Amino acid sequence: XXXXXXXXXXXXXXXXXXXXXXXXXXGYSMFAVGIGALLFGYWSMMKWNRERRRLQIEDFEARIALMPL
Amino acid sequence: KXXXXXXXXXXXXXXXXXXXXXXXXXXXXXXXXXXXXXXXXXXXXXXXXXXXXXXX
Numbered sequence: 001x002x003x004x005x006x007x008x009x010x011x012x013x014x015x016x017x018x019x020x021x022x023x024x025x026x027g028y029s030m031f032a033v034g035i036g037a038l039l040f041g042y043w044s045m046m047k048w049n050r051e052r053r054r055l056q057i058e059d060f061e062a063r064i065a066l067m068p069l
Numbered sequence: 070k071x072x073x074x075x076x077x078x079x080x081x082x083x084x085x086x087x088x089x090x091x092x093x094x095x096x097x098x099x100x101x102x103x104x105x106x107x108x109x110x111x112x113x114x115x116x117x118x119x120x121x122x123x124x125x
Contacts, residue, residue, distance in 0.1 A: 057079055058076070065076075
């Protein structure tokens with residue numbers, strides 16, 4: 001018997017198929033997070049600015065209180 | 070102690086006078102008024118007969 005190269009089929013590798021698929025973000029869903037992060041962003045930032053006003057008047061008060069300076 | 074007070078907010082600039090000391094309001098730095106003011110008169114002009122120009 002003579003032995004040569006043998007053939008293999010099984011699944012035939014599956015040639016030409018789109019492996020690319022959309023993931024995580026769809027379109028409308030990411031905009032709700034996007035503007036949602038903005039709405040949370042400005043609201044939390046301005047609370048510290050109002051807290052800065054408590055310091056702002058009190059810091060400049062030191063110059064008014066000190067006249068022997 | 071009774072010697073304690075909080076500022077709370079602001080001084081807001083308070084006005085109080087209880088010493089005066091010779092009043093002292095008019096002093097500044099000025100020495101001369103410089104001829105007070107220029108002479109001005111109002112009587113309303115009528116018409117003035119003839120123009121000042123050569124051809125009238």
